[PDB]
Symmetry: C2
Subunit: 50 residues, 2 copies
C-alpha cells in the first residue's frame, strides 16, 4: 500500500493452485458441446483424384 | 496396505513443495566451498600460438 501501483506481468503472481481432479496444469477451458448441433464438416464432392 | 507393493517411479509421487526462499524448483544441492583450498586451474604454459 505504501508504494506506487506496480503494473507488471511479473507482479501478478500467485502460488501453485490445485484444480479438481488433483491436476496442477491449468486445464483448457473449452470442451466441444454435445447439444443438438454436431460438427458440420464440409467435404468437397470430388471428381478427379478421389 | 491391501495391495501388493507397487514399485514404480510413477508411484513415488508427492505434491508441490515450497523450499526456503519461496522457490519451487528444487534447488541444486552443490555449492563450491569457500575453504582454504581454491579451484586449482591448471593452465598450459604455451609457446606456440599464445
Amino acid at each position: 500500500y505504501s508504494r506506487p501501483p506496480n503494473t507488471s506481468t511479473a507482479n501478478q503472481r500467485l502460488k501453485g493452485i490445485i484444480y479438481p481432479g488433483e491436476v496442477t496444469k491449468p486445464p483448457r477451458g473449452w470442451v466441444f458441446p454435445n447439444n443438438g448441433k454436431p460438427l458440420r464438416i464440409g467435404v468437397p464432392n470430388r471428381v478427379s483424384y478421389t
